[PDB]
Amino acid sequence: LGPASAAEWFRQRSYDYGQFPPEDLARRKRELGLTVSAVLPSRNVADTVGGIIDEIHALNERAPLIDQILVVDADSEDGTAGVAASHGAEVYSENELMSGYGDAHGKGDAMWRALSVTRGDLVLYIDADTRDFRPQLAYGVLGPVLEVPGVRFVKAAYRRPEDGGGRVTELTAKPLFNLFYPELAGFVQPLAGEFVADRELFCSIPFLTGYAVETGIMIDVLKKVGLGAMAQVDLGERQNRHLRDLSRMSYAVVRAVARRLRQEGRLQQLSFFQLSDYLHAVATPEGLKLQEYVEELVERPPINEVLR
Amino acid sequence: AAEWFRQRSYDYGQFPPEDLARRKRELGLTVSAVLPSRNVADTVGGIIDEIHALNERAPLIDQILVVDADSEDGTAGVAASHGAEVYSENELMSGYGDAHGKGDAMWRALSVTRGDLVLYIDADTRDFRPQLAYGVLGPVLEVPGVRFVKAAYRRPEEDGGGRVTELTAKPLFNLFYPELAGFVQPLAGEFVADRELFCSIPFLTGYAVETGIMIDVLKKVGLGAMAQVDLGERQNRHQHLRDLSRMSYAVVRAVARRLRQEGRLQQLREPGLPESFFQLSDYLHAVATPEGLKLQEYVEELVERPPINEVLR
Ligand SMILES: Nc1nc2c(ncn2[C@@H]2O[C@H](COP(=O)(O)O)[C@@H](O)[C@H]2O)c(=O)[nH]1
Ligand SMILES: Nc1nc2c(ncn2[C@@H]2O[C@H](COP(=O)(O)O)[C@@H](O)[C@H]2O)c(=O)[nH]1
Ligand SMILES: [Cl-]
Ligand SMILES: [Cl-]
Ligand SMILES: [Cl-]
Ligand SMILES: [Mg+2]
Ligand SMILES: [Mg+2]
Ligand SMILES: [Mg+2]
């Protein structure tokens, strides 16, 4: 059971999207009767969503792969909802889904809530701010779930135009994974927005809200199904894109690990103390300034325990 | 945290060099500047010159100490030719073998620093101004109880430090060491404390050193005895995000190590985890390249040095 090392896993569970031609995936998907829901957490992305939806439609014409497109909007003031709707996608407000829990706590919350309107056997999350969307950003990661029995969770891998990820990935995720979760060290883009798993899986794990979500899922999936059931697919080049705001992103990652460490018993007994209170000291032309942020880390339970 | 920030942050304008010099003579204290050097042939010269220039205006630094990493670029010769005392990191405490990175050089520097105060200064600084030397001296000389002063600065707009400071150090500190969240440049190379303080704490070697020092000094003298000085502008050397990854790991390992000593970290290895997955010195850096995916693998033992007092003659 399981690979013997991060090295063995890396050889056995890393793929190239060229291995999964779309029309071949479409056939297997059909033979298995599986359906796929693509979820696009959207927040002020009116200029890029249309194109992405369009590309998914064109792909489907060549190879029927995506059955449902969900734009879970953050009630964007730039008319995202409209653009998405007119381009043929289903559109939901992150605030109206599971509205008993109140307004949405950031990206993680919106992604968890999406599970209540996802109908597909498989659930594929996809960033919606992507400037130049290429077909394999949608189908690449489907490859191993459809083609390799045993694989339940697939993460995208990619490079900017030798790439080990963006700053938060390089400087927060991987160092923390290498130390506390060695099994995840082989992932090239552990925090990638594009990934897929069966809906059952997503419904059986908790979801951290805000920017903790990606880290949380990585840990929780690992615990749930085993490293052997996770994989990654090189998707070629993709163009990605303020060090200040990243600071809070990195904090969310640290909080996620910390929280999981608390629960495992690895982290015991963790005034000037308040976890959601992040002191960010900075140097400005007008002297030193100590700015202060507050973001609530909320864990939503497996949607399993709420629905059905 | 906040009460500290108000009461312990200073501007270098508050400490004119001539006042400090006068205060230093009054107090009878000597200062040793230590410059860990690794392939900085193009910059040490200027720094050593500036410090000599400063001394002429205001006698502040008594010993200029370049501790070289046997730099292939001839750094040691440059430093010598400019008037500095040069030592090889490998000849200091040579009973410990060759030096394991920057932390080791800094620890080893203590064995030959002669001053009551020890001012660490970075040697890669492409444009060096006088206050990068005297700024941090302000509080240790003029504010009672202050034993340790760290530099603060901005890049030529709310600079919260380099990539490692913003995305590794500060997030970790905010969670595990709230008291240090006030520091703008926690991992700054410019800082100063009395020689007896440095000689009485462990030093993590390599790139874990700045973090180790901040945690250890905190524990030892208390937040109240630490301060920071805004030194204005300082160009930072740009490095590859690949190499910074290794550095962030050093930071994480320092914090993890200390959490373990505090008992706040019970198990490091998660129960269930096969042994083959457990190797802290082994850092896996998964990357995408033009010719496919690859699993780069760096090995670097986290070597720690005992307080030099217990080992130095
Ligand atoms: N529904 C929703 N989407 C978000 C939120 N924050 C970011 N997103 C979206 O999720 C994707 C990736 O988010 P990122 O981490 O790059 O900001 C983008 O499509 C983006 O607009 C949010 O708070 N709510
Ligand atoms: N003696 C010595 N100095 C080093 C070493 N690594 C870095 N340094 C120096 O320490 C200072 C900090 O540079 P950095 O930490 O940004 O690489 C620079 O002056 C630099 O050249 C080392 O391994 N040995
Ligand atoms: Cl909280
Ligand atoms: Cl350790
Ligand atoms: Cl080690
Ligand atoms: Mg993004
Ligand atoms: Mg540097
Ligand atoms: Mg390892």
DSSP for A98-112?
Answer: TGGG-S--HHHHHHH
- Within 10 angstroms of residue A123's Cβ, the number of other Cβ atoms is 25
Which has the closest alpha carbon to B121: B243, B34, B232?
B34
Tokens of B70: 């046997």
Q: Resolution of the experimental model in angstroms, please?
A: 2.8
Say yes or no: CB of residue B102 within 6 Å of ligand 2.
Answer: yes
Cα torsion through A269, A274, A277, A283, rounded to 10: -80
Three-state DSSP state, A95: coil
Name residue B192's beta-bridge partners: B119, B149
Three-state DSSP state, A207: strand
Residue pair B223/B145 in contact by the 8 Å Cβ criterion: no
Question: What angle separates helix A46-62 from helix A22-32, to the nearest 10 degrees?
Answer: 70
H/E stretch holding A131: none
Which has the closest alpha carbon to A179: B272, B168, B174, B282?
B282
Residue pair A162/A229 in contact by the 8 Å Cβ criterion: no
Burial of A7 (0-12, 13-18, 19+ CB in 10 A): middle
Residue pair A247/A280 in contact by the 8 Å Cβ criterion: yes
- Within 10 angstroms of residue B56's Cβ, the number of other Cβ atoms is 8
3-state helix vs strand vs coil in chain B, percent to 5: 45, 20, 35
- Within 10 angstroms of residue B257's Cβ, the number of other Cβ atoms is 21
**Count of helix runs (H) and strand runs (E) in chain A:** 12, 12
Three-state DSSP state, B91: coil
Fill in the DSSP letter of residue B51: H
Q: For residues B253 and B266, what is the distance between their CA atoms, to the nearest angstrom?
A: 15
Atom of ligand 2 nearest to the CA of B104: 24
Q: For residues B28 and A145, what is the distance between their CA atoms, to the nearest angstrom?
A: 73
Contacts of A73 (CB under 8 A, 6+ apart): A42, A43, A80, A81, A84, A91, A92, A93, A94
From the list B248, B263, B284, which residue is nearest A268 (CB)?
A: B263
H/E stretch holding B284: strand B282-289
Q: Is B154 on the interface with A (CB under 8 A)?
A: yes
Q: For residues B121 and A256, what is the distance between their CA atoms, to the nearest angstrom?
A: 36
Q: For residues B121 and A25, what is the distance between their CA atoms, to the nearest angstrom?
A: 59
Q: After which residues is chain A broken (C to N over 2.5 A)?
A: 161, 241, 270
Q: For residues A259 and A261, what is the distance between their CA atoms, to the nearest angstrom?
A: 5
Per-residue b or e along B281-312, where b marks 16 or more CB atoms closer than 10 Å to that residue's CB: ebbbbbbbeeeebbbeeeebebbbbebbeeee
Three-state DSSP state, A129: coil
Q: For residues B193 and A183, what is the distance between their CA atoms, to the nearest angstrom?
A: 41
Q: For residues B139 and B149, what is the distance between their CA atoms, to the nearest angstrom?
A: 7
Name residue B34's beta-bridge partners: B65, B120
Say yes or no: CB of residue B36 within 6 Å of ligand 2.
Answer: yes
Q: Tell me how many domains chain A contains.
A: 1
Q: Is A34 on the interface with B (CB under 8 A)?
A: no
Surrounding residues of ion ligand 4, Cβ less than 5 A: B 257
Three-state DSSP state, A289: strand
The type of residue at B36 is: P
Which of A19, A141, A177, A178 to substitute to test the interface with B, most B CBs within 10 Å? Answer: A178
Which has the closest alpha carbon to A250: B184, B153, B169?
B169
Residue pair A139/A59 in contact by the 8 Å Cβ criterion: yes
Q: For residues B210 and B293, what is the distance between their CA atoms, to the nearest angstrom?
A: 33
Residue pair A109/A72 in contact by the 8 Å Cβ criterion: no
Q: Is A1 on the interface with B (CB under 8 A)?
A: no
Which of A191, A288, A292, A293 to substitute to test the interface with B, most B CBs within 10 Å? Answer: A288
Q: Is A285 on the interface with B (CB under 8 A)?
A: yes
Name residue A267's beta-bridge partners: B265
What is the Cβ-side half-sphere exposure of residue A193, based on CA atoms within 13 angstroms? 19
Residue pair B102/B207 in contact by the 8 Å Cβ criterion: yes
Three-state DSSP state, A266: coil
Say yes or no: CB of residue B136 within 6 Å of ligand 2.
Answer: no
Taking one residue from A and the other from B, the number of pairs with CB-CB distance under 8 angstroms is 215
Domain of B107 in residue numbering reads as 1-313
> Which whole-number Å values give the CA distances from A59 to A17, A33, A62, B73, in the listed order?
14, 19, 5, 56
* Cα-Cα end-to-end distance for chain B: 39
H/E stretch holding A180: helix A174-180
Q: For residues B150 and B4, what is the distance between their CA atoms, to the nearest angstrom?
A: 14
Contacts of A10 (CB under 8 A, 6+ apart): A186, B286, B293, B295
* DSSP of B158-188: -B--SHHIIIIIHHHHHHH-GGGTT-SSTT-
- Relative to beta strand B117-120, strand B191-194 is antiparallel
CATH number for position A76: 3.90.550.10
Ligand nearest to the CA of B281: 5
Q: For residues B72 and B92, what is the distance between their CA atoms, to the nearest angstrom?
A: 18
Residue pair B227/B8 in contact by the 8 Å Cβ criterion: yes
Surrounding residues of ion ligand 7, Cβ less than 5 A: B 237
Q: For residues A286 and A223, what is the distance between their CA atoms, to the nearest angstrom?
A: 48
Burial of A43 (0-12, 13-18, 19+ CB in 10 A): middle
Q: Is the dihedral of CA A142, A146, A150, A152 positive or negative?
A: positive
